From a paper:
Mouse MHC I is also called histocompatibility system 2 (H-2), which is located on chromosome 17, and there are 3 classically expressed MHC I genes, H-2K, H-2D, and H-2L. MHC I and CD8+ T-cell epitopes interact in the peptide-binding groove of MHC class I molecules and form the peptide-MHC I (pMHC I) complex. In addition, using the structural landscape of H-2Kb bound to the Gp40/15-SVF9 peptide (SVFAIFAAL), we delineated the molecular basis for immunodominant C. parvum Gp40/15-derived T-cell epitope cross-reactivity toward H-2Kb and human HLA-A*0201.
H-2Kb complexed with SVF9 was crystallized in the P1211 space group with a high resolution of 2.3 Å. Within one asymmetric unit, there are two H-2Kb molecules, referred to below as M1 and M2. The comparison showed that the carbon backbones of the SVF9 peptide in M1 and M2 are not coincident, and the distances between the P4 and P5 atoms of the peptides could reach 1.6 Å and 1.2 Å, respectively. The SVF9 peptide bound to the H-2Kb cleft via canonical primary anchors of small hydrophobic residues, P2 Val and P9 Leu, characteristics similar to those of H-2Kb and HLA-A*0201. In M1, there are 16 hydrogen bonds between the peptide-binding groove (PBG) and the SVF9 peptide, but in M2, there are 19 hydrogen bonds and one salt bridge. Moreover, among the water molecules involved in the hydrogen bond network between the PBG and the SVF9 peptide, 5 water molecules form 5 direct hydrogen bonds with the SVF9 peptide in M1, but no water molecules are involved in M2. The P4 Ala and P5 Ile residues exhibit double conformations in the M2 molecule.
Numbering used by the authors:
A (entry chain A): 1 to 275
B (entry chain C): 1 to 9
C (entry chain B): 1 to 99
Write the structure that this text describes.
Amino acid sequence: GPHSLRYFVTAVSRPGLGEPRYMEVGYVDDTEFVRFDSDAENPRYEPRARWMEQEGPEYWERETQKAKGNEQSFRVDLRTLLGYYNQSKGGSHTIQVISGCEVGSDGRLLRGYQQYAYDGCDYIALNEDLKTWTAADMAALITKHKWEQAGEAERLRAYLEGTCVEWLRRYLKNGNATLLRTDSPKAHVTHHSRPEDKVTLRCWALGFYPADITLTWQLNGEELIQDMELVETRPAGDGTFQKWASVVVPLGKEQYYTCHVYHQGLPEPLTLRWE
Amino acid sequence: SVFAIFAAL
Amino acid sequence: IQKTPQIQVYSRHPPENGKPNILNCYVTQFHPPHIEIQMLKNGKKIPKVEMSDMSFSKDWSFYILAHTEFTPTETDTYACRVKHASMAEPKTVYWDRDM
Ligand code: NI
Ligand code: NI
Ligand code: NI
C-alpha cells in the first residue's frame, strides 16, 4: 500500500515548576511504535509495539542520545521564541513538530513532512519542493532567514530522502505482521427512545483496523448529512478502533432507516437496521 | 529513526 | 488559544457483569497540554490510572487515552472527571453501557 514514517514532537515550558517536558512519539501508518517522554521515571526511547523488541540495545542507546540532544535544543528554541514574540519569562509555552516521510509502491519519496507550531498555531513548514520554507508570521521569517543561511533544507532532505525512507522499509518488514493486517468491523444498531416520541438510532462499528472508516444513515437512497451525530474514531486500547453514527427518527418509522459501514476489510459495505 | 539535532529557531 | 476537551468514557470489550474488562477515558481537542483526569467508581478516585499516553493530531490539539482494569456489576457507576484551564468547573462524563 502507501505507507508513512512520522515523528510527533512536543516541548512545553513549565517555568518555576521545573525544566520543559520534551516528548517524541513515532508512528508507522498512523500507528504508535516508539515513545520518549522526559517525565518518565527513567527517560529513554521505549518500544510501544511488539515487533520493535526485535532491535538491540545499540538502537535504543542511539535514539535516546538523539532525544537527549533534541531535548536540550528545544529548550533553547522555547527561549528564542519568547524573544521573537516579546513574551514574559513566566508563562507556559509549547513547540510541536511533525517530522516524516511517505512512500508508495515505488519505495521512493512521495511527500516530505517538517511542520512546526508555537502555542498551537502554524509557525513554519518545509514546502513540497523539499528546498523552501513557508513562514506563518513575522517571527517565523527570522527562523526562515537563519535556516536559509545555514542550508537547513539540505541537511533535512538528506534525512528525508535517505535515512527516513531506509528506516521506513526496515520498520515495515519487522512489523508488517500487525501493520498491513485488517480487522473488519463488527457493527450493530441500538434503539434509545427520546422525548416527544422520537428514537435515536445509533450505528456502532467495533474492533476494526485500520482506523479509516465511513458510517452513513439513509432513507431509500438519500444520505442524511445534516441530522447525523458522529463521534471521533476512538482506540479500544488493544490496537483496534470504535466509532458510532446516530440519527433522530419518528417512532413507528425506525425500520425505513439503513446504516452502511465502509472499511478496507469489506469488499461491500455492511447494511444494518434496528430491532 | 527521528531527525536528530533539529535546527535552532 | 484555549480549546474545550471532548470526553468519551467506554469499555475496551462489550460489557458483561462479573467479566474483567478495561474502562477507557478518551479526552481530545484540548490545548494547552496541561490537564488533570481522574476515573471514578461510585464517585471515588480509582488509584494508579495511567495519565501518560499523550500525543497530538495534525491540527496540533492534544489527546490522551487513560485506562484502568474493572469488573462491571449491575449497580456500580463509572465516570471520568476532567479539569482543564479552558473550563471554569470540572466536567464529569459517566460510563453509559446501553449507548
Ligand atoms: Ni434492539
Ligand atoms: Ni494540575
Ligand atoms: Ni494498564
